[PDB]
Design a protein around this ligand. Structure first.
Ligand code: 2YP
Length: 386
């Protein structure tokens, strides 16, 4: 029962991810609120690219009166709860002054929670082996995004008043908090010196960001693309295209976990993540397709499947890069580089979805990152050595 703790706490650090991301865009795209500004909510998670600049300051000192007299997952999760609940309670489309009143605060709190959830509890009490112990968290997180996001809006759409859905989420945090009660000045810079001390620091830096650049386009404006001027025709039916792909990706990752051990060809990443582009064509093939009966359901279960499989492979390679004394203090840096592409991709993608429509944005712009996989082949000269 040692691992049973992680999953429950996973939902604490997996829920707030979608409330400023896909569900905020679905909530704005259900109203008119233009088209460009729906994607202008991508700089909200700017806190997920500066999280390493203050990763060590939060911990270490933790004076008892300020913090540590109760676990810090509480000192982040309770504060997060008020901000999330107040986010939706404000004006839906009349006065949008909340664009930053509760978007930046939510991202700040989440980025402050995932850091303390990877530092003070992950490697301090892992019981040595961290492979399966950490593989359980990915599942206690994927499932948190499944609870929110697509399936979450299924009841919100039927129910009258989107603020009620927020009360569901603020109420889904109550079990977290209750199951958790029973579950340095120079610190900022001294770590960073070991990341650029390699030959291949800049090459790995570029590879980390450009590899997933393609995978971010296909999850940037899917919510608006389907319901808006497209054969989806609904919003209630959103489970068809916003839930199936989460269960498909979680399952794909689970297959990836056993398969990686089953790896018989050293390619690993190359083959497991090369097809991430041919899977995105599922959307393009539906771009010229009428609403149909099941058409959009063919791609939802296949595209999110391919990237889902490659998820574990990415994270696992990202973990091996940094397992030294500095520990997760430096891991968080590689987790700031992974979200840079998907945080800033919105406005740029939208500008391209304005001039040349949707289709050619799915064909060329999406496949821009397939060459990056080709570049990974060169990067396999130094990666193979280790
Ligand atoms: C260990 C961990 O929590 N990593 C990050 C998490 O990524 C997860 C990521 O989920 C993505 C967003 C998703 O599938 O929607 C998944 N993929 C990668 C590459 O990180 C995987 O799931 C747990 C962790 O790793 O998300 C945020 C990144 O900005 C951050 O809160 C957090 O650093």
């Amino acid at each position: 029962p040692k691992s049973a703790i992680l999953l429950i706490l996973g939902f604490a650090s997996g829920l707030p991810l979608a409330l400023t991301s896909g569900t905020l865009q679905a909530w704005m795209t259900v109203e008119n609120i233009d088209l460009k500004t729906i994607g202008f909510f991508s700089l909200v998670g700017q806190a997920y690219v500066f999280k390493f600049l203050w990763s060590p300051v939060m911990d270490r000192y933790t004076p008892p009166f300020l913090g540590r007299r109760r676990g810090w997952l509480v000192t982040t999760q309770i504060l997060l709860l008020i901000a999330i609940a107040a986010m939706g309670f404000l004006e839906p489309g009349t006065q949008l002054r909340w664009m930053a009143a509760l978007a930046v605060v939510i991202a700040f709190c989440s980025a402050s929670q995932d850091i303390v959830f990877d530092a003070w509890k992950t490697d301090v009490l892992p019981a040595e082996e961290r492979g399966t112990g950490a593989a359980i968290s990915v599942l206690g997180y994927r499932l948190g995004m499944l609870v929110s996001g697509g399936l979450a809006l299924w009841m919100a759409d039927k129910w009258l008043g989107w603020q009620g859905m927020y009360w569901l989420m603020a109420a889904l945090l109550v079990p977290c908090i209750i199951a958790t009660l029973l579950a340095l000045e120079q610190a900022v810079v001294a770590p960073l010196r070991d990341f650029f001390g390699r030959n291949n620091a800049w090459l790995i830096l570029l590879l980390i960001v450009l590899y997933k650049l393609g995978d971010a386009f296909a999850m940037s404006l899917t919510t608006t693309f389907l319901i808006r001027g497209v054969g989806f025709d609904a919003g209630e039916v959103g489970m068809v295209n916003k839930t199936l792909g989460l269960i498909a990706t979680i399952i794909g990752a689970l297959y990836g976990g056993v398969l990686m051990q089953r790896l018989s060809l050293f390619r690993a990443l190359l083959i497991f993540g090369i097809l991430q582009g041919v899977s995105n064509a599922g959307y393009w093939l539906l771009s010229i397709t009428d609403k149909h009966l099941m058409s959009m359901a063919v791609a939802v279960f296949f595209e999110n499947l391919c990237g889902g499989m490659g998820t574990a492979a990415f994270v696992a390679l990202l973990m091996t890069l940094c397992n030294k004394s500095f520990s997760a203090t430096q891991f968080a840096l590689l987790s700031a580089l992974s979200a840079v592409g998907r945080v800033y991709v919105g406005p740029i993608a939208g500008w391209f979805v304005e001039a040349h429509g949707w289709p050619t944005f799915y064909l060329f712009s999406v496949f821009a990152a397939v060459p990056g996989i080709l570049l990974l082949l060169i990067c396999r000269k130094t990666l193979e050595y280790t």
